[PDB]
């Protein structure tokens, strides 16, 4: 009875940025699930395609835990069929996404007085992302007709932009840690206590 | 999203322009904040832009005299010009550069603060009452005469009277100082019982005079 | 650098009509065009971005079209609040703002309400006198104001000021100030202000005696 290391991804000391989201393949274990849903410390717990209670008695071929950090007003973009700077250039969920989107406020951790500018997010990109695509390219983006010879300037902007996280920010502009569980469904390797 | 703005309005033809602009209700993250000015009838001229990370883009004409800055702590960014001439007298806007479909446009514009550049000193506005002397509709106002430089803010009853208030634009007199008048149409019977007061404030001279108008 | 030209320079259209503003480019730009609206006493806004995409919070009346070098902004129904100056911008290589087109609102002929204000006793103690004549709500803007001091027409001692078109009734307002010295003000008695406007069948005169 080896439970899945959900404490290693949810409580993770340092979280990766949304443009370079961290995926941890979870396999060969039993998912408690009910322990995560019982905790009231999460501000958003939306599931798609599968009921959270039925997952406690079901099995899947593989599960993936995608963890990153965004802002409050951007959590609504972590959902199937969403548009925005996060859903198009950073983390795109499929229109047939089968899983759960979990998010909670982390203003007392990732925010520092004077500003914590270590979390980044892609601001420019010539085409929207594919579902579950990950872009870490630091290539200078060409906005206008002028060629961009790898030097920043007018219509020559660095694609990544830093977040401004201060404890004095509004409730909708604070750092929120998001964990997305993708249920890839071959023999099943992750089951619930029911089975 | 709104933008507050500070800055001096009267400088000498050899001093230094200094203007700051703070952002409220929005972190200065996914924006390329810029300064844009427009001299009277000249047309808009793009001064320069800056981001949170400090990257600076400038106009090739005034690239030598402009030194932008950014204070991510106070959510503010400044603009400084060296050796400002008389041709620099314009209304300076601080504008935010949105990122809409990979094209940086200018959605959150600001009101703007004019910077008059002249060796002449500052003057204080003299407020005089225009007392009411038609049928059932009287007219009164205040006269803001002899001041420099523009602008001045005029409000009636501390911003509580907004119906029928017409504030005329200033006109440069032959003396070199400005003069304007703000009038309001009020009911005839409300003159005796109600109290009408105009509130004038001239920031370049720190003058804030409140003058009450009464019938003669 | 590409230059932007706007046609026409001024448009006078009544409420409920369709105004089509053109912004031509000297070089090829594509879809890197945007239309801005500058209200008379307010900061400008962004109406159309990317030559066809309507910005957030913009009414559906404003619609952009065109690609390449000829763009058109079409206001479906002019409302009294749409009285403003509209200019275009391009971001194909360098930012070049357009010249600008003023949108004027036509309305029914409104006769002005004339008032006259003698100089206050505080200003008379200063040594200068200013007699203010007011034309409150009128259309069209053309209005002749003539000052008479004891039936003597004055010319070079007056300066006028006109407000922009109102956002509610689309009417103007004019103020004519007559600047005289304290001595010259008390050397005469009758001070009148005659106004000649289109909506008035006969010129209206508002006078006052200094002793009253
Ligand atoms: C995230 O951590 C909290 C805090 O837990 C403690 O510190 C951890 C580093 C680890 O040593 C835990 O065993 C500690 O209890 C967890 O909250 C506790 O979790 C345990 C799980 O066995 C539970 O029995 C307690 O009742 C929880 N206490 C409170 C106050 O909530 C939390 O469960 C961790 N998150 C996940 C997803 O496991």
Q: Which of C105, C133, C162 is the endpoint of a domain?
A: C105
Place of tokens 């835990």: A65
Cα Rg, chain B, nearest whole Å? 21
- Which ligand 1 atom is at minimum distance from the Cα of A9? 37
Q: Whose CA is nearest to atom 29 of ligand 1?
A: A39
DSSP string, chain A: --B--THHHHS-SS--BSTT-EEEEE-SEE---HHHHH-TT-SEEEEESS-TTGGGG-EESEEEEEEEEEEGGGGGGSSTT--SHHHHHT----TT--EEEEEEE-HHHH--TT-B---EEE---SSPPPTT------PPEE-SSS---S--BTTEE-SEEE--B-TTS-GGGSEEEEEEEEEE-----EE-S--
**C135 and C202 share a domain?**
yes
Q: Which atom of ligand 1 is nearest to the CA of A41?
A: 31
Is the same domain home to C94 and C10?
yes
Contact indicator for B117, B86 with CB cutoff of 8 Å: yes
Chain-centroid distance of CA A83 in Å reads: 15
| A142 and A103 share one domain | no
Resolution in A: 3.7
Q: Are C99 and C120 members of one domain?
A: no
Claim to verify: residue C95 and residue C153 sit in the same structural domain: no
- A61 and A148 in a single domain? The answer is no
Q: Which of B57, B72, B103 sits opposite A153 (nearest CB)?
A: B57
**Do A104 and A130 fall into the same domain?**
no
Residues A176 and A154 in one domain: no
Radius of gyration of chain A, Cα coordinates, nearest whole angstrom: 18
- Give the distance from residue A188's alpha carbon to the nearest chain B alpha carbon, in angstroms: 42
Question: Cα dist. B205→B93, C13, C206 in Å?
Answer: 22, 43, 36
Burial class (CB in 10 A: 0-12, 13-18, 19+), B56: middle
A151 part of contact set with chain B, CB < 8 Å: no
Q: Which of A2, A7, A38, A67 to mutate to test the pocket of ligand 1 (most atoms within 8 A of CB)?
A: A7
Ligand 1 contacts (CB < 6 A) are A 6-7, 10-11, 36
**What's the gap in Å between A34 CA and the centre of ligand 1?**
14
Residue C47 near residue B105, CB atoms below 8 Å: no
Q: Mark whether A132 and A153 lie in a shared domain.
A: yes
- On whether both A161 and A100 belong to a single domain, the answer is no
Q: Given C81, C105, C129, which residue is the final one in a domain? A: C105
Does C131 lie in the same domain as C76? no
Nearest chain A Cα to C90, which residue? A144
Whether residue C82 sits in one domain with residue C28? yes
Within this chain, do residues C64 and C29 fall inside the same structural domain, yes or no? yes
User: Measured between CB atoms, does B30 come within 8 Å of chain A?
Assistant: yes
Do both A137 and A76 map to the same domain?
no
CA A178 to chain centre: 5
Q: Which of A192, A122, A130, A129 is nearest to A163 (CA)?
A: A122
In chain B the domains, ranked by start, together with CATH numbers, are 2-117 (2.60.40.10), 126-213 (2.60.40.10)
Contact C91 A143 (CB under 8 A): yes
CB nearest to B109's CB, from C45, C116, C160: C45
Closest residue, chain C, to B132 (C-alpha): C117
CA distances from A94 to A69, A135, C62 (A): 19, 16, 34
Whether A28 and A99 share a structural domain:
yes
Calpha distance A76→A91 (Å, rounded): 12
Helix, strand or coil, per DSSP, at residue C48: strand
Residues C70 and C126 in one domain: no
**C170, C80 Cβ separation under 8 angstroms:** yes
Same domain, C101 and C8: yes
Any B CB within 8 A of C45 CB: yes
- C148 and C189 share one domain: yes
| CA nearest to B27 within chain A | A164
Q: How far apart are CA C72 and CA C74, in angstroms?
A: 6
Domain tally, chain C:
2
On whether both A43 and A69 belong to a single domain, the answer is yes
Phi-psi region of A16 (alpha: psi -120 to 50; beta: other; left: phi over 0): beta
Residue A190 shares a structural domain with residue A154? no
Residues 153-172 of A with CB under 8 A from C: 154-155
Please give the tally of structural domains in chain A. 2
Cα B189 to chain centroid distance, Å, stands at 36
List of chain C residues whose C-beta atoms are within 8 Å of the C-beta of residue B107: 45-46, 49, 55-56
Question: Of C43, C77, C105, which marks where a domain is finished?
Answer: C105
Cross-chain CB nearest to C161 (options B104, B105, B171): B171
CB contact under 8 A, C91 and B104: yes
Report CA-CA distances (Å) from A138 to A120, A122, A141, B207. 12, 9, 9, 53
Print the domain residue range for C83: 4-105
| C35 and C127 fall within a common domain | no
Read off the CATH number of the domain in which C57 is found.
2.60.40.10
What is the domain range of residue A66? 1-114+167-195
Q: How far is CA C14 from CA A46, C39, C63, C74, C80, in A?
A: 52, 18, 19, 15, 9
In the reported structure, the alpha carbon of residue A33 is separated from the centroid of ligand 1 by a whole-number distance in angstroms of 14
Residue with tokens 């443009």: A19
Q: Do residues A102 and A37 both lie within one domain? A: yes
B94 min Cα distance to partner chain A (Å) = 18
How far out from the chain centre does Cα A123 lie?
Answer: 16
Would you give the distance in Å from CA C126 to the centre of its chain? 33
- Provide the token pair at C13: 């259209």
- Partners of C208 in the beta sheet? C191
Question: How would you classify the pairing of strands C144-149 and B171-172?
Answer: unpaired
My answer on whether A133 and A104 are in the same domain is: no
Is residue C71 domain-shared with residue C89, that is, in the same domain?
yes
């Amino acid at each position: 009875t080896n439970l899945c290391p959900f404490g290693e991804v949810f409580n993770a000391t340092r979280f990766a940025s949304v443009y370079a989201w961290n995926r941890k393949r979870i396999s060969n274990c039993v998912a408690d699930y009910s322990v995560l849903y019982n905790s009231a410390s999460f501000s958003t717990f939306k599931c798609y395609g599968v009921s959270p209670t039925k997952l406690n008695d079901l099995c899947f071929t593989n599960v993936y835990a995608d963890s990153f950090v965004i802002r409050g007003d951007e959590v609504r973009q972590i959902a199937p069929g969403q548009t925005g700077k996060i859903a198009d250039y950073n983390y795109k969920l499929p229109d047939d996404f089968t899983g759960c989107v979990i998010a909670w406020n982390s203003n007392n951790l990732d925010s520092k007085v004077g500003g914590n500018y270590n979390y980044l997010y892609r601001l420019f990109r010539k085409s929207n992302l594919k579902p579950f695509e990950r872009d870490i390219s630091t290539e200078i983006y060409q906005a206008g007709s002028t060629p961009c010879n790898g030097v920043e300037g007018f219509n020559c902007y660095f694609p990544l932009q830093s977040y401004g996280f201060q404890p004095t920010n509004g409730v909708g502009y604070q750092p929120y840690r998001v964990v997305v569980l993708s249920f890839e469904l071959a023999p099943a390797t992750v089951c619930g206590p029911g089975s | 999203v709104q933008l507050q703005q500070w800055g001096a309005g009267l400088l000498k033809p050899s001093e230094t322009l200094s203007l700051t602009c703070v952002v409220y209700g929005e972190t200065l993250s996914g924006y390329y904040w810029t300064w844009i000015r427009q001299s009277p009838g000249k047309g808009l001229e793009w001064i320069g832009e800056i981001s949170l990370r400090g990257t600076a883009n400038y106009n090739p004409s005034l690239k030598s005299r402009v030194t932008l800055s950014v204070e991510a702590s106070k959510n503010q960014f400044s603009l400084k010009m060296t050796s400002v001439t008389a041709a620099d007298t314009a209304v300076y806007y601080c504008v935010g550069g949105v990122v809409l479909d990979n094209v940086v446009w200018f959605d959150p514009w600001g009101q703007g603060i004019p910077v008059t550049v002249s060796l002449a000193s500052t003057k204080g506005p003299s407020v005089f009452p225009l007392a009411p002397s038609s049928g059932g509709t009287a007219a009164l106002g205040c006269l803001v005469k002899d001041y420099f430089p523009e602008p001045v803010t005029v409000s009636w009853n501390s911003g509580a009277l907004t119906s029928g208030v017409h504030t005329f634009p200033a006109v440069l007199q032959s003396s070199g100082l400005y003069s304007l008048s703000s009038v309001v149409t009020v009911p005839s019977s409300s003159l005796g019982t109600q109290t009408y007061i105009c509130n004038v404030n001239h920031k370049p001279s720190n003058t804030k005079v409140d003058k009450k108008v009464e019938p003669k | 650098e590409s230059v932007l030209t706007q046609s026409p320079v001024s448009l006078s259209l009544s409420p409920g009509e369709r105004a089509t503003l053109s912004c031509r480019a000297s070089q090829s730009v594509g879809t890197y065009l945007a239309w801005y609206q500058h209200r008379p006493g307010q900061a400008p806004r962004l109406l159309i971005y990317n030559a066809s995409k309507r910005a957030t919070g913009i009414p559906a009346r404003f619609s952009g079209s065109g690609s390449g070098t000829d763009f058109t902004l079409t206001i479906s129904s002019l409302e009294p609040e749409d009285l403003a100056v509209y200019f275009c911008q391009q971001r194909s290589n360098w930012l070049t703002f357009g010249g600008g087109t003023k949108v004027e609102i036509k309305r029914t002929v409104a006769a002005p309400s004339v008032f006259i204000f003698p100089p206050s006793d505080e200003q008379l103690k200063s040594g200068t006198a200013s007699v203010v004549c007011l034309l409150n709500n009128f259309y069209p803007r053309e209005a002749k104001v003539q000052w008479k001091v004891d039936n003597a027409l004055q010319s070079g001692n007056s300066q006028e000021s006109v407000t922009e078109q109102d956002s509610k009734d689309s009417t103007y307002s004019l103020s004519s100030t007559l600047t005289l010295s304290k001595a010259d003000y008390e050397k005469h008695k009758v001070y009148a202000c005659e106004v000649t406007h289109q909506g008035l069948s006969s010129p209206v005169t508002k006078s006052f005696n200094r002793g009253e």
